[PDB]
Design a protein around this motif. Structure first.
Motif: not given
Ligand SMILES: Nc1nc2c(ncn2[C@@H]2O[C@H](COP(=O)(O)OP(=O)(O)CP(=O)(O)O)[C@@H](O)[C@H]2O)c(=O)[nH]1
Lengths: 498, 85, 82, 205
Positions: A440-445, A461-470, A472-476, A480-482
């Motif tokens: 849905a919406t852009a992974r607010w860093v 720990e199952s709800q993380l994801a690496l990004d461009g440049g190492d 970890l925001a939350y997950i997009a 409601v999760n934001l």
RNA sequence: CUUGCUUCUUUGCUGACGAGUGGCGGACGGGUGAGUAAUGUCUGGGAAACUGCCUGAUGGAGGGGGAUAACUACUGGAAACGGUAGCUAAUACCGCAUAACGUCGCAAGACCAAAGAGGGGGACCUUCGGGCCUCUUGCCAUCGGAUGUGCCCAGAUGGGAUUAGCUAGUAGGUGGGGUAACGGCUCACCUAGGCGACGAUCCCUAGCUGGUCUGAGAGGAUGACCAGCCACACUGGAACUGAGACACGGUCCAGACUCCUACGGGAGGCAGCAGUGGGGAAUAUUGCACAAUGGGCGCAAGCCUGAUGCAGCCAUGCCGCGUGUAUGAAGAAGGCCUUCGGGUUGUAAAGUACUUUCAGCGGGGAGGAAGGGAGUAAAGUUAAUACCUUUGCUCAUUGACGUUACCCGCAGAAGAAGCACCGGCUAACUCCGUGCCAGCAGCCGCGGUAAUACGGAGGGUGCAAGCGUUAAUCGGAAUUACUGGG
């Protein structure tokens, strides 16, 4: 009266922004003739072998899904070339580009293109511009009639009457010059009633418009127009004199302390784009720089401000007629290309000891499209490197979930056909045909400070994801999760990094 | 290859005629004495040997001949012309 | 052309020069005829700082070995009357 | 590198007092020695030859605080020396600097002596040494620098030095904390209990 | 016009110098082991040799000529790249006189060479270009010494007999030519010899060695990094310059590939340093500088050096340190087991008293540095207190590493512990969930409903910034036995 500042004054900037299907490529290829040198997926810079001055160009893709580049490269360019088609008219493209350009008060010269096709009445088009842009204009010429009858240019502030010949797109040809304005031989060669209608329209221009300004041209209150076609090799030939005479010296740019003029030192060449380079043997990523302040040196040692390191850079590529030329130094006011390998991001400042930053980076929030699923799954390392190589860009940011499959392509625009075409190179061989998967919406860093993010990693720990440049925001996944992430209170000095 | 030191190429071209041309005329004089060996005239053989001796000693002096080739020529050619005489 | 020169042995940030007789076309750590003495630039005052056998050096001077600047400075360090 | 854990559980595991909890207080009897090394320490093991060799090795090592690769290096250094390997190995273990600081009484336990060596306080021959594996040469003098001298931690732990055997091969001044090292220790002088023969048999295979 | 504060046309006149000729270097330094089973390497000898630059001894360095680039004018091509008509210099080229222990010849006899530049100056002479006086440097011929290179012989240096005869310039001799030189090295003639069961010819593999690992030793594999030799520079072949290449950043031809073009024509070879693609399980930065050594040139000052001295990444390997220490029973809380008495985790943790190694920050601070430049006192040289070599002595000085190693101060135990195993081999025990399903395993092997063997929990053991797995070699394997089997 040193020649240094006298050739600083000979350095001018005109990037080129317009509608889709407007004619950027044709007018640039024909200005390359004037100096003896899908659609639109590139950015090109032309320095010029020009006689009088040396006026840089910088191309950009013009669309709504494209032109994310031009938000930060109209900050590099002091002036503005508008190109508006009569069949397109004043649309939301021009309103977005004027909402960009009114923030810095750029001088604007407009150029109405496509004179071979049908064009409406001139007063109607100027009233549409002055109404839907709320900014006046000062017309100088108007060509002949309507349809295919456009066969002349009648200057008012120069008193010059030029004629047009058809079929001159391949070779540069010259048409003879008629000096007089009330010449009856001009009425015999062109047509009497059409020329009388043109003279009546010029009288309506003289009775219903204003004159040119110089101190108000700097802010851009009265923007001049220029007419002519891009294919007939005629109308853009008169643009060069206006580019020399109207554009001033390149203005100082704002820092956190104050404005840095073009007579100072301590090179302020920060990097604008990290554009998708073609790769014969090396990448270099790109280095477009603002070297307006300070004359080049061949053995100069730059200083990375955000990492505070003394970096020896002696090789600098110049864009002579599009081709990446040899090792050459020049006069300040140009745009370079250097040899970087994954070290410099967008907007990394440079000085010689002034440890301050600029006020740029106008980039926006993305809209996360579907996936990477690795069709023909042998040799996965070309996309584990080569798209992460493209992840440093402002348009493309590749996101890595923990489960090592289903890598996310992050685009700010909509058309991800750019990356699909870019997957057909020497080190790019995977197809990856798209489908529909909802993210849905852009992974607010956001990344928290120490002694706080450890428990944030340990709870979900199952709800993380690496990004461009190492990162970890939350997950997009959803809003409601934001909201739960905002309820989680990650109190930290915020870094956007977009 | 693009190199500032390509001058040694064409200068060696400037050598490969001239020095070799001297070598050329040198060996023809040597072959002339062999004509006397095919002639049987010992006086003409002595005259040809006295004609070829200073130029072959000069070419032994100028670095082209390494002063043991020309000594071998003088040795075996003198042996032939006094075996004939 | 034979010469008497240093060879730069030792460890990283720990130099230890070998004054040695070798041909000029040989490498620095390459082939040599024989070794004579040594030099240590970090050998500040202790039991031994520099040995230098002058007999073989004089024998190579009698043969035509070109002495470099550092070896001549070590000859001026090992002085005949000091 | 250091163990930094249950230093008294090791004494129950080996059964004998490893002197890891020497301290200011005397023999504790606060951990149920010899009858509970762990959860199922009531079991009587088969205790084979490789078993007693490994227990003897780990006993001597957790007395002296030496890791396995380092003790194998000490065995390789003791193998090339003269005499016999068993005396030379224990002489190299005694030649550690932290063991000398422990024998002087400059610290209650061996970890305290290793910490005192490590914290730029122990100085031999006017040169400060931080590494506890300093091979102490004969005829040296060990002391504490004036900026780290007697901040009470050497003081009360020196009183434990009044209760120890105070061996012959080293002498302490006890007025200015200036020790003096001497000849190498004889096998019949150091602790009279540990077995070098099982260590030689373990490191010989 | 502030007639000296600047602009301006000429001017190599000075410091220096793009391009050109010429001298040296490019045959060293750097990279790889593709080919090679002996034409290679190692060990030990030998003569039929060369040797610029280094250096010793003995003489000369006397006298002349003609071209050419650069340059001038025009012109073909977009560029790359030349042509035509003229001019000139040298330490560039070539003659002439002479020449010795040099070359040839048994001897008599014959023949062979050059080049001059730079600093300073007293008398004489100055067409006032200078000859002359001195010093430095360079050239030619020979004899030597060292270094390096060329050539030959013996021994040693993998497997295969499912590799048994091979060779015809082949083996030997005479004569001619060729190489710094013996030599079928190369041609004319004569004989049928030469190699071979002690492995000749053929196939596969392989750079060789000093060395490395393992093994008590004998042996086995390897030789990647350090060093010596050999061969190679997209493949094959060939020659020229040069003392030395039959040539990595030199030439030509045959083949493949890439790039530019105005399409008439050209340019190229990262098995160099970095860096890119493909392959793989696997390996880095398109970094700084000659601060030190060495190499190239110069008399020197100076110039280049991806060799090197380093800087960045990787626990890839070794070494050392720390992640606290002393005290501390209510034998606290939680977990596990139980006979439910209690035990274990556990002096572990909490509390108290101290300490700050290594990191963070802020200040001092060596050594890697010898030299070189200016100048003075001056011993030599000479006619010379002038030029030049050398020694004391005065001054400004030469660091990429480098916010260096190292030392001091400040905050707070404060930022720093994991991995394998627990039936036997082999170091260490229970409970719960399935039950020859799920699974582990190096071998014997467990699991078929009360598993010290699967998974989870507790606990212990071992190693430690590393721990397990996988892959190769050796030992155990006296299961390749000559030591050491039948
Ligand atoms: N006859 C004629 N056609 C024109 C002229 N200018 C543009 N066009 C036409 O309009 C279209 C524009 O082409 P193009 O130059 O690629 O547009 P663009 O401006 O580069 C697109 P973008 O703005 O996204 O970069 C083409 O079809 C072109 O032929 C003109 O002066 N005359």
């Amino acid at each position: 009266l040193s020649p240094y500042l006298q050739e600083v004054a000979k350095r001018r900037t005109f990037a080129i922004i317009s509608h889709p299907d407007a004619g950027k490529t044709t007018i640039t290829e024909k200005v390359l003739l004037f100096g003896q040198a899908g659609i639109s997926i590139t950015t090109s810079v032309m320095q010029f072998p020009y006689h009088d001055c040396l006026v840089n160009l910088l191309d950009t893709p013009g669309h709504e899904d494209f032109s994310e580049d031009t938000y930060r490269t109209l900050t590099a360019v002091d002036c503005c070339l508008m190109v508006i088609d009569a069949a397109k008219g004043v649309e939301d493209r021009t309103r977005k580009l004027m909402e960009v350009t009114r923030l810095r008060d750029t001088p604007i010269l407009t150029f109405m293109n496509k004179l071979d096709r049908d064009i409406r009445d001139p007063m109607e088009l100027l009233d549409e511009v002055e109404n839907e842009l709320k900014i006046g204009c000062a017309p100088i010429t108007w060509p002949i009639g309507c349809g295919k009858l456009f066969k002349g240019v009648y200057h008012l502030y120069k008193d010059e009457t030029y004629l047009y010949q058809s079929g001159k797109g391949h070779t540069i040809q010259e048409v003879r010059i008629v000096k007089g304005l009330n010449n009856p031989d001009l009425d015999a060669a062109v047509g009497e009633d059409l020329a009388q209608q043109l003279r009546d329209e010029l009288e309506l221009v003289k009775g219903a418009s204003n004159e040119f300004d110089k101190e108000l041209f700097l802010a851009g209150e009265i923007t001049p127009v220029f007419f002519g076609t891009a294919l007939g090799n005629f109308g853009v030939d008169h643009m060069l004199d206006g580019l020399v005479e109207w554009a001033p010296a390149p203005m100082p740019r704002q820092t956190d302390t104050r404005t840095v003029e073009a007579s100072e030192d301590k090179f302020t060449g920060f990097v604008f784009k990290i554009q998708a380079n073609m790769d014969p043997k090396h990448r270099d990523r790109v280095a477009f720089m603002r070297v307006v302040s300070g004359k080049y040196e061949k053995g100069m040692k730059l200083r990375q401000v955000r990492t505070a390191k003394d970096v020896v850079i002696s090789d600098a590529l110049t864009f002579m007629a599009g081709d990446r030329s040899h090792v050459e130094e020049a006069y300040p006011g140009d745009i370079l290309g250097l040899h970087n390998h994954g070290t410099i991001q967008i907007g990394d400042t440079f000085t010689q000891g002034e440890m301050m930053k600029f006020t740029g980076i106008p980039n926006f929030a993305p809209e996360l499209f579907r996936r990477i699923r690795l069709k023909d799954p042998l040799k996965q390392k070309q996309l584990l490197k080569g798209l992460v190589q493209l992840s440093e860009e402002g348009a493309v940011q590749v996101f890595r979930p923990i489960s090592n499959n289903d890598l996310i392509v992050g685009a700010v625009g909509v058309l991800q056909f750019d990356v699909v075409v870019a997957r057909l190179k020497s080190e790019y061989n995977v197809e990856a045909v798209y489908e529909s998967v909802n993210v849905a919406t852009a992974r607010w860093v956001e990344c928290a400070d120490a002694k706080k993010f450890e428990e944030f990693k340990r709870k979900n720990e199952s709800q993380l994801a690496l990004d461009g440049g190492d990162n970890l925001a939350y997950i997009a996944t959803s809003m409601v999760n934001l909201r739960l992430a905002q309820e989680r209170y990650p109190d930290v000095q915020f870094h956007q990094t977009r | 290859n693009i190199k500032s030191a390509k001058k040694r190429a064409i200068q060696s071209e400037k050598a490969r005629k001239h020095n070799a041309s001297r070598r050329s005329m040198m060996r023809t004089f040597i072959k002339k004495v062999y004509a006397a060996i095919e002639a049987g005239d010992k006086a003409a053989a002595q005259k040809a040997f006295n004609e070829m001796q200073p130029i072959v000693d000069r070419q032994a002096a100028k670095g082209l001949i390494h002063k043991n080739k020309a000594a071998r020529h003088k040795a075996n050619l003198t042996a032939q012309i006094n075996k004939l005489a | 052309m034979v010469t008497i020169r240093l060879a730069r042995h030792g460890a990283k940030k720990r130099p230890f020069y070998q004054v040695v007789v070798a041909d000029s076309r040989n490498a620095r750590n390459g082939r040599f005829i024989e070794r004579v003495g040594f030099f240590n630039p970090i050998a500040s005052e202790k039991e031994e700082g520099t040995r230098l056998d002058l007999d073989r050096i004089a024998h190579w001077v009698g043969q035509g070995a070109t002495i470099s600047d550092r070896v001549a400075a070590l000859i001026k360090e090992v002085n005949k009357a000091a | 590198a250091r163990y930094l854990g249950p230093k008294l559980k090791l004494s129950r595991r080996e059964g004998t007092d490893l002197f890891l909890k020497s301290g200011v207080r005397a023999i504790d009897t606060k951990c149920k020695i010899e009858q509970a090394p762990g959860q199922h320490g009531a079991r009587k093991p088969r205790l084979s030859d490789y078993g007693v060799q490994l227990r003897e090795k780990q006993k001597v090592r957790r007395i002296y605080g030496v890791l396995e690769r380092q003790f194998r290096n000490y065995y390789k250094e003791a193998a090339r020396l003269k005499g016999n390997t068993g005396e030379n190995l224990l002489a190299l273990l005694e030649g550690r600097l932290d063991n000398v600081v422990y024998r002087m009484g400059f610290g209650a336990t061996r970890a305290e002596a290793r910490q005192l060596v490590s914290h730029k306080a122990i100085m031999v021959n006017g040169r400060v040494v931080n590494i506890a594996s300093y091979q102490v040469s004969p005829n040296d003098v060990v002391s504490i620098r004036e900026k780290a001298k007697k901040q009470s931690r050497v003081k009360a732990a020196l009183e434990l030095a009044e209760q120890r055997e105070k061996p012959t091969w080293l002498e302490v001044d006890a007025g200015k904390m200036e020790g003096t090292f001497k000849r190498k220790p004889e096998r019949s002088d150091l602790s009279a209990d540990i077995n070098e023969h099982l260590i030689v048999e373990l490191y010989s295979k």
